[PDB]
């Protein structure tokens, strides 16, 4: 841990890259908006929020690629890169993340993305939520 | 054009495997030489640079050297979500402590990074074929 507030930093951010495994254990990388929840016990773990964009679709048809579901480990990176490397500074989360069609989860998802991004004042959120229980947390500066 | 599109971006994110299997990531900037040979997969090169590390011997070496297989992602991201785009290289890795690969990396990122114009680098470079290419945009 670098001495700045790393999960403030990482909460902040507007954008961050998730790695999930392939079937055949292989990394995979998409790009993510979310939100992080702060723990309301000292000792408890951040959970982290991200919805998926769905269209209106049958129950069960239409298939995604990726496992998360398979393999439940994820990582999740902020960098605040700049063209000056004084500037530099990243932070990443390791955990495990559970993917929610309804419920709780779900639920507080779309209230915190709602809280922390504007853009969804226009933009729908109807999709399921994946939440990362976070159990490592690391960061770096210049 | 995705490819062109990811090597001009300043940064990537790049994800290796732990040795448990799991996920790795660490920013790296990085240059793209796409050869002028048909059949032949882009190579991505990122070294072990003068930014601030207690130690040449970082994870993601470590990591390659055990399995090959990664993944380096380039976002282009806004507050406008219509500009947002991304483009998602996957391949084989190879750490390079020394050789031709080490000098081909070191003038590669030279040229893409003025930053780097007047830093001593003497750490291993990294080189990844690229198997797949994947890419969205908005
Ligand atoms: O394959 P797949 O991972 O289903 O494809 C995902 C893409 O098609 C595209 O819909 C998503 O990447 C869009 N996308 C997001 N799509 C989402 O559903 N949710 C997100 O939080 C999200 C964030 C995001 C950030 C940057 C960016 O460039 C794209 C983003
Ligand atoms: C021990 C070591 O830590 P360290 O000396 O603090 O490493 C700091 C480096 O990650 C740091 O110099 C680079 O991230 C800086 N850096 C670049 N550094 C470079 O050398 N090359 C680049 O292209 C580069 C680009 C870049 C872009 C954005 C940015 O924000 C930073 C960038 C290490 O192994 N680091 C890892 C990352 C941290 C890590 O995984 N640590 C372990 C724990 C340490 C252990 O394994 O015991 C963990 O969290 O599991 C690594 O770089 O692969
Ligand atoms: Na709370």
Redesign the interface.
Known sequence: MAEFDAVTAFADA??A?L???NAD???????VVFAVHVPHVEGQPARIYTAVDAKRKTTRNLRRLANIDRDS?????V?H?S?D?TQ?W?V?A?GVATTHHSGDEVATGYALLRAKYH?YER?SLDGPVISVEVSRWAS???
């Not at 254990?25 to 790009?31: D, N, Q, R």
């Open positions: 507007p954008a890259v790695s999930t495994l254990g292989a990394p995979h990388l998409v790009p480990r994820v990582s999740l990176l960098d890169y063209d490397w530099l990243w990443r390791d853009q933009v770096w500066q210049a």
